[PDB]
Amino acid sequence: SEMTPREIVSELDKHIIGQDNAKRSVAIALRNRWRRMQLNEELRHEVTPKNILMIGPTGVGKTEIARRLAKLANAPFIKVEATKFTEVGYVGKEVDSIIRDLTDAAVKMVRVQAIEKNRYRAEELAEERILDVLIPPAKNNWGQTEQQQEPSAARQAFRKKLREGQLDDKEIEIDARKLKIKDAMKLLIEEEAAKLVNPEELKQDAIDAVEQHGIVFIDEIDKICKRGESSGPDVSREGVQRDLLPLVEGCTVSTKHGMVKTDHILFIASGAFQIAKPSDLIPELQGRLPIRVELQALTTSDFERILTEPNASITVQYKALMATEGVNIEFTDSGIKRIAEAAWQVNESTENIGARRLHTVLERLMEEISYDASDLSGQNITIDADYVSKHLDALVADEDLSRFIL
Amino acid sequence: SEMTPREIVSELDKHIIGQDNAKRSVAIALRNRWRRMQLNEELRHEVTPKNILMIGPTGVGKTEIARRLAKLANAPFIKVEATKFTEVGYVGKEVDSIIRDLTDAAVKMVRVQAIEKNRYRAEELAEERILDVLIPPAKNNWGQTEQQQEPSAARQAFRKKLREGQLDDKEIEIDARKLKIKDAMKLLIEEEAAKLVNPEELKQDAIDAVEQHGIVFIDEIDKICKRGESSGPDVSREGVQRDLLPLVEGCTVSTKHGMVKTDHILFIASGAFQIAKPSDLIPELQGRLPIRVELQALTTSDFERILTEPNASITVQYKALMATEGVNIEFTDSGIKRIAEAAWQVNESTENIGARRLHTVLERLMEEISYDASDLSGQNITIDADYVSKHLDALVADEDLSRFIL
Amino acid sequence: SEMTPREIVSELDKHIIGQDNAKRSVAIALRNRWRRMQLNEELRHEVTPKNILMIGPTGVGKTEIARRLAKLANAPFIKVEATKFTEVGYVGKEVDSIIRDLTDAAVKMVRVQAIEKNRYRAEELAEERILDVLIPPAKNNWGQTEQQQEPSAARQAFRKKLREGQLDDKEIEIDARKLKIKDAMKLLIEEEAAKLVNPEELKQDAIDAVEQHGIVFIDEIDKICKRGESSGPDVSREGVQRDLLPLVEGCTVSTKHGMVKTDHILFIASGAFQIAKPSDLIPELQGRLPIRVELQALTTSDFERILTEPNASITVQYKALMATEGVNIEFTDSGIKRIAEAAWQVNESTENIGARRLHTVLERLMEEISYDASDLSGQNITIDADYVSKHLDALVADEDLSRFIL
Amino acid sequence: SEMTPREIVSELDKHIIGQDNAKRSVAIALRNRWRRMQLNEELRHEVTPKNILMIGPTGVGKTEIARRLAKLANAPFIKVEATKFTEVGYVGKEVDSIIRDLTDAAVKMVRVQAIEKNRYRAEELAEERILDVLIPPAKNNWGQTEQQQEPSAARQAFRKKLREGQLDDKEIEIDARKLKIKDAMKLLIEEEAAKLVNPEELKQDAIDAVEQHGIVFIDEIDKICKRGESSGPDVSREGVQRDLLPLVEGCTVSTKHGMVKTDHILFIASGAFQIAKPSDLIPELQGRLPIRVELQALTTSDFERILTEPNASITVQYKALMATEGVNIEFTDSGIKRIAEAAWQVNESTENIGARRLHTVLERLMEEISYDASDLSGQNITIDADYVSKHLDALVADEDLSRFIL
Ligand SMILES: Nc1ncnc2c1ncn2[C@@H]1O[C@H](COP(=O)(O)OP(=O)(O)OP(=O)(O)O)[C@@H](O)[C@H]1O
Ligand SMILES: Nc1ncnc2c1ncn2[C@@H]1O[C@H](COP(=O)(O)OP(=O)(O)OP(=O)(O)O)[C@@H](O)[C@H]1O
Numbered sequence A, B, C, D: 001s002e003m004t005p006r007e008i009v010s011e012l013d014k015h016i017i018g019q020d021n022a023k024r025s026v027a028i029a030l031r032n033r034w035r036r037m038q039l040n041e042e043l044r045h046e047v048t049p050k051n052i053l054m055i056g057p058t059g060v061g062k063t064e065i066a067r068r069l070a071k072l073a074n075a076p077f078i079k080v081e082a083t084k085f086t087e088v089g090y091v092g093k094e095v096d097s098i099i100r101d102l103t104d105a106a107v108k109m110v111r112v113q114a115i116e117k118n119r120y121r122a123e124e125l126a127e128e129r130i131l132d133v134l135i136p137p138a139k140n141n142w143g144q145t146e147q148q149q150e151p152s153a154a155r156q157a158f159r160k161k162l163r164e165g166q167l168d169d170k171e172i173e174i175d176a177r178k179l180k181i182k183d184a185m186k187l188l189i190e191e192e193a194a195k196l197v198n199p200e201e202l203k204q205d206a207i208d209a210v211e212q213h214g215i216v217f218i219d220e221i222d223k224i225c226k227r228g229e230s231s232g233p234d235v236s237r238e239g240v241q242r243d244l245l246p247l248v249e250g251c252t253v254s255t256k257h258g259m260v261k262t263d264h265i266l267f268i269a270s271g272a273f274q275i276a277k278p279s280d281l282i283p284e285l286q287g288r289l290p291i292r293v294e295l296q297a298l299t300t301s302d303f304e305r306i307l308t309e310p311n312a313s314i315t316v317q318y319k320a321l322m323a324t325e326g327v328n329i330e331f332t333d334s335g336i337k338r339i340a341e342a343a344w345q346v347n348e349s350t351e352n353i354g355a356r357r358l359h360t361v362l363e364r365l366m367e368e369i370s371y372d373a374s375d376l377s378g379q380n381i382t383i384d385a386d387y388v389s390k391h392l393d394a395l396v397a398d399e400d401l402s403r404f405i406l
């Protein structure tokens, strides 16, 4: 019961732009899950996760692809920065935390997993107990087949009003106190929800989810490589590698949820490696990170697509926000293409993040509309190619200024 | 469970190519545990473990030999980076942790031993309780010799239905809560398995495990010797050697599961010793590491062998996974040759990382296939030397690339 | 339980060759506790103990004597490494630990002490309760002097059968259930075993083992002296001597097992003192180490004795372990002298590590036999001067190998 | 109600040898206590303690004089090392601890102080509750002037029997259980002593004792002075002075016993000042350490007196210890004089501690008797001048050896 290499890339194709290779890789990894759990007992142990190591610059999709991947398989996920554990110079943060955190993440996974499952039932019972105070039921009933006319037009009346209308004052009993529907409603929900939920029967779900589906994204694992010094003193970082193997090559670790294996968890490390090369990773890590994939630096089209396609692109969002003031914003193809060329420019000119650059540029170009929105009520402003250039040109052209306000 | 040296080396031979000297070393050790038992009280508690110190390059087998050695011995094992405690002014953990961890590992094993031993007894009584809800048994019974017709076609009915067919709804009491068979089953099993397991028995058992068969493996021991670039931080690395002394000389450490004595734990310290010499260790430690053995670098022939001969060889493992997709992979002998050859080349032209290299090369090689797979069910794909060159020659040629991908 | 100095030196002489003066010092320390134990209330607590300070090279027997003295004393022993507490840039655990550990160590002895002490009592009562089910005793009895004919030939019959024979099916009552002697026996043992064990006592019994018999061995008490190089770190070492004082002065520390008074713990400080001198210890501490004793470096003859005279000498150890495989090892006098000379020579040409060198040397010399043993069953192998030469001479000479193998 | 400068010195003259100056000084400070608490309210605030700073070598009486002084006024006391708080380079110990500790010290003062104070009261309330079970009192009573005939001959009967007689079986109620007077007595006493032990009525006793009579002995405050560096970097210590000011010039500090002032606690810091001079202390401290006193180095006579006079001199102690074996030791004037000259010699020759040196010398000189004591039963050994010189001469003469075994 699992998707496949290609079928996976499709799903990822519905959220990430470009980076097909990387996709194919997280695709395979995810598939080998369903491949192992499909073998004899003697192998299940022998075959270890095919960890992937992503190589690319920022703003190009790395981390998203992992989120999306873990999401795509509702798998416990966690993102850490290799350097977070480098503060060993004097401070102290230990790797165990990674898995430790992962489990938590899982317990929240499984938790929320039950809630949203029967949240309706709760709300139902919740509003099924608010009608009792509105129309004090006369003890004893039932007996015939009038289940349809049983709730009485009374309860049915307040029913419609409650879920769809006024009603915002009364007192409900718990353990009897005055309150208010809009809140007493959110008071019962949690209570009711309790009844449905279970306890120690969360272990073989969370610890299992983790140990069998968890995914870890180890960011900038390149910030913890060799470096110019010596393989002895500058170990303040190499030693951070020597601290991950246990996690990477199967070890254990106790958590406030029990014991977690880690023997076969999917690790996806990533770096730009524009200084150090994956080859500088200690041999144990090289060994355990078999799948190597390089991501490409984004292009204006990517940018153009990242501005539009996304169900919640900054574009749609902005339009949304200004509609709050009565203004009707509209980004036109040329406009978008233009914001796109604006980002690319700045990335190119100055330092180069990636899709990141879209935020300041867009918020910059809309400064005046953003400030004047209130007075632009009822108007229809359209951001075309003209607009954009006579707002962003001056700035983009000015590299120095770009390093500050863009 | 006590086999002879020559035999122990024969098992080891099944998962590790070459390194005979190392195999004999470890086998002698394992073997003495049986010899010591044949001894009288006095000697039995005078004869200590012949801790090993392995000397060799990376990816040649030092650790693999220790795992496999612990496995055929069925003993709680544990890897530890010597450096995990190093610091020129940092923090780190405490060495005793090594015994806490090893002990957890002993409990884990024991739990398993007992569960699978009487898993039936559990599942049995488990469903034996799911039938009671399905068919409320009328209090009081027995009396005659009708044991067959006693479970009444009623229970017998559900029983087949339950075990075989359909799993799916009701409410069973614990501490009365609606559930679902397919799940209430797993719930009851654990609940039932419990009653069977004797805590003190497994706690004591888990201990003897560690105390009488523990095998700890200290990697990168040479990363603790002298150095010379300082005085404090170096005699601080030495600090790690001092801290380990109690464990190797015999001491007691307190753990969740009780008090553990280290006097009979076998220690396998490993090291490349390219910079320092085993003579650079602190005397007390050199004293506690009687047996010394040097493992040798692997050769291309070795890689070919490593590729297919070991038991769950990566080759056989690849084939297994692919089969899951209905694909039949086969490796040409020359295919196997070109691969070992590619790896060697890279290890030679970049960073030599031993047998480890084989993984990365094998993954890259079979990626296009791995991604297709599903779309090749029923096909017999053969990896001949032509396939191995078309997919790796260029890569191997690009020394930069190899530093990134292979 | 208290013997004279002269007698302790006699016990000491069964395991440690030479170092008579030290055996004496230690002998006095011990007899001295018994003496203080003979005083009145007035002095019992107004008698400042006589901690030892051992001065000597490595591998000459300082630790050994303390251990073995702790054994004949049958006292919980612990061995601290003076430096563990220094840190010119670390945390360095706090000395409290020494009494902590010792206590954990005391507890163990006590536990396994009590058990193996009155085990017979349990197994006896255990089976004494299995005969009750075999031959249901008729209530009320006794009265005359028919004590040996009272158990009746019935109980006496099953008695012999039980401990020496069949009988493997029966149901016993605990808290009434069918079982099986083979296991119902063990089941009872632990149950009864409980009865005898006093948890409110042994905890105390532990403190009474510690506070009044506890021996501590502080090593490298010389790696704590002034030094000179700098000044900050020195007072950082001296910090350990300052902090060390209360223990040797006589105080109370708190453990997970209660409060413990360090007042009668015998302290054995020890050091090589190659760079530093006792006179360089902090005045407070010097005066608190009234008993001073030196140990002489060992000589080849000594090695030869260490090799054979001691009770369970490594020689008698190997010969024993080999006979376990049915091999008759005979060490010729010529063979011993060469082992001793080989060790001495390596200690001369590389790092001198005292008697420890004999271990590595002996092991190496014996590996081949040690591996082949099983197949050499029934044969005789004489380790004589010629035998020693073939196996060691090449290695001893090759100074680079000796820094790795011997 | 207080002694006087002279009268105090005498008390100190009863335990310390020489060092009259320092005595006269601690005397004065102690007296100013009784002088301030004797002035108008406006002054009591204005006048602060006249802190004393002792200047002298080790082994001459400093700390002893402070103990004796705090004892002489049963004042809370504490001795700290200035350097203890210098481990600030990387570790961490804070001065608050000092007062923090001081209070504890006080609560222990007041504690054993309270018990023996109202010990009678407890026992009374104890047996007063044991008669209730013996003669179950009839509820309701009193009313007339029959206080003498009220206890009834019944309670009065058991009263005498109890404290002076049999009665050793009964059950008392606590939290109702059978016991035995002989024990049921000691059980009630403590349990009763609890009610008395001023629960919260311990505050205005400890915090008061501390705040009004506390004495702090700050050892080696010279180890935290200027030093060759700069008044900015080497502040790792000068900053330690900047941390005592608060305490010395009155601040506060919270303790698990409440709040403590510190405004006027007597501080007695000391140092040898053979490197740094009191002039190097930061100005604030100099200001707050008004009384400056120099102690002199001990003399053989001092040594001679230190050996004999003390009610528990090492000499008496030894004679005692050996009597445990039947031997009758006797130090003769010439003998002691000789041990004195021997200590002085070594102090002079090598490094010079002080009285300290008496421990090893005496224990060295008695080595043989100490070892042979057992066989010397019934004999009368006399350590005269002869004995000593022909046991200690060769060693004292040998400076080098002196630095090790003396
Ligand atoms: N004969 C062999 N020699 C080397 N590696 C082998 C051999 N057979 C299989 N392998 C595999 O090669 C990898 C090498 O890892 P291993 O830890 O054994 O190397 P190592 O050099 O001993 O490591 P370390 O330097 O950390 O002690 C493992 O994944 C192991 O399973
Ligand atoms: N008479 C002896 N003299 C020296 N070593 C001996 C003797 N008998 C046995 N040995 C063995 O020699 C080794 C030396 O260890 P020991 O701890 O006694 O030396 P040490 O110099 O006191 O050590 P450290 O410097 O760690 O305090 C031990 O393995 C010990 O068992």
Ligand SMILES: [Mg+2]
Pocket: B056, B057, B058, B219, B220, B270, B271, B272
């Ligand atoms: Mg290694």
